[PDB]
Symmetry: none
Subunit: 250 residues, 6 copies
Amino acid sequence: SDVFHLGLTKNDLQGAQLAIVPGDPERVEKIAALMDKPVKLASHREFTSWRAELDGKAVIVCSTGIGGPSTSIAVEELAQLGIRTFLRIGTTGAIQPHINVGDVLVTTASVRLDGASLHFAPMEFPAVADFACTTALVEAAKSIGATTHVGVTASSDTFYPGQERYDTYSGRVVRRFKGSMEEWQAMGVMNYEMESATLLTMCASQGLRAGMVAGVIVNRTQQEIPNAETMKQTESHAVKIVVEAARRLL
Amino acid sequence: SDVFHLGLTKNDLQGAQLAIVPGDPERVEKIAALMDKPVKLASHREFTSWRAELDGKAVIVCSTGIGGPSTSIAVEELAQLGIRTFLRIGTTGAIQPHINVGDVLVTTASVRLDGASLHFAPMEFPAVADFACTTALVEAAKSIGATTHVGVTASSDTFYPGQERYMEEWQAMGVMNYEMESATLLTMCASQGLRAGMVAGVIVNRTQTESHAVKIVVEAARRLL
Amino acid sequence: SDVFHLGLTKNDLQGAQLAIVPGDPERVEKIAALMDKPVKLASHREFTSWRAELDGKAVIVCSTGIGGPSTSIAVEELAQLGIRTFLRIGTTGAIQPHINVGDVLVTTASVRLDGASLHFAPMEFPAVADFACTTALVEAAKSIGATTHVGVTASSDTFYPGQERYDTYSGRVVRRFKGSMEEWQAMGVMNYEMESATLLTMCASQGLRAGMVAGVIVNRTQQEIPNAETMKQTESHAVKIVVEAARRLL
Amino acid sequence: SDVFHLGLTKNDLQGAQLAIVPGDPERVEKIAALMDKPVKLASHREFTSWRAELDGKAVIVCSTGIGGPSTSIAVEELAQLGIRTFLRIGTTGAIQPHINVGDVLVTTASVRLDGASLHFAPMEFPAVADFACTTALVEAAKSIGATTHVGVTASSDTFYPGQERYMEEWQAMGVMNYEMESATLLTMCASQGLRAGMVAGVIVNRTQTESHAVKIVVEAARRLL
Amino acid sequence: SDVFHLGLTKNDLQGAQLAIVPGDPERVEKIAALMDKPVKLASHREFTSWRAELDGKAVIVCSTGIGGPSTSIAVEELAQLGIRTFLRIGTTGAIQPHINVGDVLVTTASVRLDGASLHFAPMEFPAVADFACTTALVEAAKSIGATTHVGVTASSDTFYPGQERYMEEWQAMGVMNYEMESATLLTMCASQGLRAGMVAGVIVNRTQTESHAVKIVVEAARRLL
Amino acid sequence: SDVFHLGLTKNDLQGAQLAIVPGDPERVEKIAALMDKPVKLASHREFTSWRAELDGKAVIVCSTGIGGPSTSIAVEELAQLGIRTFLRIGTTGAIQPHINVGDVLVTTASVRLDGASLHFAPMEFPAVADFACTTALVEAAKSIGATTHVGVTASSDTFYPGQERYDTYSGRVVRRFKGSMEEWQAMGVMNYEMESATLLTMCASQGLRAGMVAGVIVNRTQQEIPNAETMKQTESHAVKIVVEAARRLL
């Protein structure tokens, strides 16, 4: 209404200045439920929004969708709506053998293998998280007793060739990404996802604070497959971390 | 069950070798309604998929979401399930003074201003549409008496900053329109042995009625089976 | 005279608005011979021009020379002279095993492995053919009964390393082109030539129509070598196609 | 004897796993003087190195010289001798109006406008500081009551032309300051399993007292042993 | 018979290890006429080749055509037949106020604004002339009393747009002149163990007699046998 | 004093218009000693300066430090001080098996694997030496009876990965430089060093003359290791060459 995609007015946010941003609209209710007086605001495409209260202050939970283009829309309009702090929650696979399912990852900066970030800063600019957000996430994780890894994430415009997956229709990856996974592994990159390069670059270049946490639900480099219930329990822990991080940032 | 995102099996497709891929679920239902025996299959995240029938052959309609990245997931996972031809329909603005609201644009090739196309081929490779799909879209547009323009589309990762929203090089170069998905779609199919076509209805033009593009894409699909 | 290289005046063209553009001046006479009243206009360097008539309308046949720089000169001056439609005729090798000598290729767009095209549009711009020209070529081929392949061509500033040839004086190719042939093969590229990236990019960016057809005279990926007479018969067929395509574009 | 440039052996380090790396030898002596049992080890070309002790553990102080290239030699050769954590201290100007002469800047990440960082990772990889080192620098600054800003630094190969010396894009993007070494240092460590932090004291600001940054880096070092 | 384009055999060269490579066939005949026992060998497409003799040794003169692409074919195919030294002569404009019509330019290296040079070496590699060839051209120019300038030439794929024809950065950087072939020629030879030199006569200058450059290239050739 | 790093005034140079520029301040005295009346001017960081006389004319000898950034400072300030000709002296390893320890290298142009040069001209611009300087160096070498190689040098912003060294802490080189040494070897590159791309590019683009000579003290591609005294004798010869080259340029 006040914005062009989310279907939200300013007053709907009730002065909220922090937002928690999952990718999947299915996860918006369950995260808002952790907090006081969860109310459903709107639901348009993959932008589902709920509002809640935390220590007396209004908070927003809004889905971003998949990929940088979708995310940029969500972040841009929420920034217009007055949101100044963004905490990304996700579930992810790991790319390091010593990172286990059920572990938690806090991202300090991202490898920019995407397109939308370049609209906000040149490639030379770092896709870096805010120090306060990162600190809050690291502290909330440790308070919960989570096994935590803090470092670089690779952020890709594709799920398949940019993550060097070969079990595809064509079975081929373009030269740019051939051997790329081994390279990132050697450089200490923790995981692959698809949204953070846009999130972190647009926030760092525009005076906004952002951070990201993710629960490890799978590991491509490990032979053992993840349990059914442990994936659901890792997801709830990650949610717990992000809410408890948000409490310190209000 | 067979793919990571879409929630579909090979069997769900009942031999379908063509998919129509608009951006949004509201458009999916609208397209499937034009065909025989429409059935909703699945809805996960951005990807809502229906199955239908054209001349006794199965066709799928599946939403892509916003941008190359989500589009790339949809196309790959449909290709894994046996689709070999993709037709996209959208609605857009135009940037050429002689293009009217109500006209239909068939894209021959796209300017590659996205990030995802580069995950399939280096920049020097053309974001070109398949000749058969392009022909079938042009045929079907003439079939319902649509005013048709055929040419190049500019495709970017941003909706506002990559469309002049407070440079006129694309206009001077004869670019018809702006959107966000065609560069990824066309490059990813042309560099991987899949056929792809792209059609759009003109809804706005800064120098100066969507159901038609939907009928056209369906009637194009028929010619390609 | 009116132009700086071709040695032609406007009136010489007699209102001609379509031109057929081979690379080799030797082929200009034989293509003009297919048409009514073939007259030799001029011959300067590798720019040999003939004029003819087709269904009552004047047509030009002009050689481009080798490579994008030479071609850009020819196209630019003929555009100045009033030519608005350009049909390229060539003979070529194929890069796909299932493409046979005697087959005909119609190019929808080109991989831009050249330099001159960048002077007309940035690399992001597609080296795409005109739809009407492409349609006319495809229809003329089928009317003649030719086995036709429609798709992407790789257009290179070199005959040797850009086409990944190793049987050279040095025996080496620079990293950019090492493994490049296998890459294009996997992406469905039909053939290599040296002029189309400039032709198609300059026409598509300047409101001019262009298309390209070529007869396959050799195939590097096949063990069998081409017959002597079959190469000469493929050349005459390609010529037939381009003239019959031109008839539909007047 | 063990390395090409520095003139040091493993044994010279007596188990040191942390080094402090300023640009110049005058600063090296100043830093080592703040610690226990300071000893000069070597002086070759740009690389003057001292050894000292913090809480009974060995630490090294070694000058880098000017720019990424000399910095890259120092860090690599110290890593070969067993150092796994690097802290850099500098003095700089600021480009933000609210940053005062006397304030302390802790760099989270750098803009990569150098040439040497590319010898370690492609441009898309972030020139990001280690979280522990960054935390320890922020803690130590608060410990002596310093006014602290935490954010991004621009890092280039030129002192004059890459600093406006007869474009304001870095200011508009929230960049704190300019220097010449941090991009190489942060990228080279983050992409090779080494921890790195960076701190600077503000000595000038075009929109408007170095001993403090030296004490801070030493007290940060202590927390990281 | 031995090569793809030129229509020549090894035997046609009678032991020649040097070629002179101007752009056009009219210039080829002119150059060969200055030498002993001139003989036309072949004429196919852009490539017209003569053989001649200097101090009892065989030399070839072969036209390149327009641009790096045609030049690249000529040089490669001559190299396959045994040529190891190439000298190019051209005629050009100058872009420096002190360079006069009638002066001679010997190119030490070229600005790489072509596309074909990149098919031989990445952009960071210098389009540099061979020292012996450069020396011999400078010697031969002084021999006939020519006014000589020695320096950098800008080399592009376009004749008009890449020469200011309705940016002055090349003038400010000391570039002597513009042409279209030297970047490809110099890069392709320097990166493949072949010697190359380049000389030109000034025929125009926007800030203000070709037979001389032809004599100079021949007399340079003599010194290199 | 007149400059911001070297600690020198204009009058200190006594009208000197040529400078000899080693990297190491330790070598400044020994080169100035070859000439008449060697006086120590200043010594600040790695910028040690001495002045001397040669055939009656004042000459400067000034160290540059390591790398392009350091060198650019030295060259820039000496240019401000009136120096118009720069002769680089160095000692180097070779990358060609047929180049022997004790040989001398004169550089015609440099491969620009550095950052600072790009601040003076775009990458398309050649890092080319002055013809007079190159000629003087080649002639001084031959007069001394040195075995001389004239050609391209690779100039790198790093000593380790940009020179494709694997005997490092991490043991890895980034894809850009993987296989790079074999590439330069095949292209006829003589050696690696770290300063010339900046020196030559800034001089060629600013109307200043520069050249470079170096004595070969080691060869990575040879099994035999260099003698102790032969390295010291190669260094003195290179010094002799540079002074005798300077005599011809005054």
